[PDB]
Each structure stands twice: as C-alpha cells, then as structure tokens.
Design a binder for this molecule. Structure first.
Ligand SMILES: Cc1cc(Nc2ncnc3ccc(NC4=NC(C)(C)CO4)cc23)ccc1Oc1ccn2ncnc2c1
Ligand SMILES: [Cl-]
Length: 289
C-alpha cells in the first residue's frame, strides 16, 4: 500500500529512456521502461524531464504545483486523469507515469481520420468530461485542455494529462531560455484571453474546443486566422462550425461551452450526463459515412 504523504523515488538504474515522444515549453517526454529493483516486473512508462535551462523560479512554480496535485490525488485518483508513479532525480527532475500506448488523442484521431467509430468518439467525450469533473471536485483547474493533452490507453479508455502545468515563464535579461511558447489563444475562453482569468468555467470552453477537435478528426481550430483577430471575432459571435459527423444536439453543447457569459456554460457534471446519454445511443447523435 503506497503511503500517500511520501514520494516514490526511482533510481536512474531502474529507468531506461527508449524514444523521444515529443516536447513543450517546460520539458521533454520520453517513452521508457521502469524495472523496479528487487522485483521481476517491467512497466512501460512516459518520463517528462523538466528543462534544465528554465528559470529556477519557473521550475519551482511547476514542480511545487505538480507535488500539490500529486498529494491531492494520492488519496483517490480518477481512471480518466494521469497518475504520477514516481520521480527520478539526477542533474534533472524526471516525472514518471504509465505509458499510454496509443499516444496523444490528437495524433490518434488524425492517424485514424477514416476508421474511428461514432460510439468511441462519444465515449471519449464522456471520459474527458469525467476526468475534468474529478479535477473540479478536487479544486484543480486544468488551464490547457486540448486534444494534444488527452492520452489514449486503448480505444476503450482515455486520460487527461498536463493539467495545472501551463503558466507564464519567469525570464531574465541574460540567463536561462526566454521561450515561453505561443499562448494557446484558439483554445482559450475570452476572459482568459482578455484578463488571464483561468477557472473551471474557462476549462469548459477549452473542453468545447477539444470535442470539436475530436469530431473533426483533429482539424486545427480557426486555422489561418491570425491570433490578434480571435477576441474580436468571438465578441461578434463567430464560432467554430458544426463538425459534419455531428447532429445539432452535439453542436448545441459545444456552442454552450463557448458562451461569453461563463455562468451560461455547462457544468462538467452536466457534460458527463449528456455525453453518457449520447454514447449509449450513438446512432442518434454522430453519423460517420
Ligand atoms: C510524465 C508525463 C508524461 C506525459 N505524456 C505521456 N504520458 C503517458 N503516455 C504518453 C504517451 C505518448 C505521449 N506522446 C506525446 N506527448 C506529446 C509530447 C504531447 C507528443 O507526443 C505522451 C505520453 C505528460 C505529462 C507527464 O508529466 C506528468 C507529471 C506529473 N503528473 N501527475 C499526474 N500525471 C502527471 C504527468
Ligand atoms: Cl476553423
């Protein structure tokens, strides 16, 4: 039985990096193997190495938040939210989770543009809503929900990751990198763009964009529109168009997620109930070819 207030430290000799999976502003993700000493098991893992030349103020903010969430979620997790297995300390901080062998949901839907099932798409919408409802219940705001930050364990099972990560990068005149990366304007609630306000209700907006990504098999939201134009087009009432495979019932939920009045957006518990109803009767709600 793991002790919820303790941290599991993995020795560097118990971990092997096999492949670079990708990277972002704050670290590099590797596919790896965890072989716990004194056992006869091997665990496929993902290893996120925090960037060495990031400002120490920034890396403390990121790791402190990771710890806070890890201890909040130790008591009881969610099947639909990634779980920290342990950390490896070398010259670098290496955060270790179970490998999700079908990778990023964005890549999964783009690779399978043709052959994905209506019931699977709706089930993933439900599971993402369940993961987000868990984060809201333990008082954690995601701040960067997107199809790139949902992982595929199997066609039966997705998990949210990279929650409570996104933040302004502290920078210096001469030392460290100054690559804060691009602001994900095209996923953000208007109040997040205008006022840097991030709440459970701005997560609901991003959830709407994530569902749109899934239902379009990974189309790029507002493709070809300069970021500077986004807040004005949102205030004028322009929105992402209805995905061809969707009924109006599904699109009405997406549009409610993008209400300027955050209090008019759905609650994650309502999104769980709506997508559970639709996943049960998929032929009523989504039609592929
Ligand atoms: C260790 C770690 C791993 C991941 N990511 C993956 N994880 C698992 N399987 C995967 C399979 C494929 C891909 N592919 C892929 N990801 C891109 C870089 C986007 C492009 O290509 C990624 C993962 C995300 C975050 C992360 O860090 C934490 C830290 C703390 N906590 N606490 C609870 N959860 C975490 C997670
Ligand atoms: Cl678009």
């Amino acid at each position: 039985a793991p002790n919820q207030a303790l941290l599991r430290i993995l020795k560097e000799t118990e971990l092997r990096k096999v492949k670079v999976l990708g990277s972002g502003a704050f670290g590099t993700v590797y596919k790896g193997i965890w072989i716990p000493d004194g056992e006869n098991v091997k665990i496929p893992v993902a290893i996120k190495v925090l960037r060495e030349n990031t400002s120490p103020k920034a890396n403390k903010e990121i790791l402190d938040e990771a710890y806070v969430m890890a201890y909040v979620m130790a008591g009881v997790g969610s099947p639909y939210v990634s779980r920290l297995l342990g950390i490896c300390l070398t010259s670098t901080v290496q955060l270790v989770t179970q490998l999700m062998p079908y990778g990023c949901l964005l890549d999964h839907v783009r690779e399978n543009r043709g052959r994905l099932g209506s019931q699977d798409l709706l089930n993933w919408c439900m599971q993402i809503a369940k993961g987000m409802s868990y984060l809201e219940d333990v008082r954690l705001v995601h701040r960067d929900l997107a199809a790139r930050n949902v992982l595929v364990k199997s066609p039966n099972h997705v998990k949210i990751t990279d929650f409570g990560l996104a933040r302004l990068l502290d920078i210096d005149e001469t030392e460290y990198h100054a690559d804060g990366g691009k602001v994900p304007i095209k996923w953000m609630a208007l109040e997040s763009i205008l006022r840097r306000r991030f709440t459970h209700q701005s997560d609901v907006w991003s959830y709407g964009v994530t569902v749109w990504e899934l239902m379009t098999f990974g189309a790029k939201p507002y493709d070809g529109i300069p970021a500077r134009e986004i807040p004005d087009l949102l205030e004028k009432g322009e929105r992402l168009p209805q995905p061809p495979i969707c009924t109006i019932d599904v699109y009405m939920i997406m549009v409610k997620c993008w209400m300027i009045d955050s209090e008019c957006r759905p609650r994650f518990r309502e999104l769980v109930s709506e997508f559970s109803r639709m996943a049960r009767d998929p032929q009523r709600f989504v039609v592929i070819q």
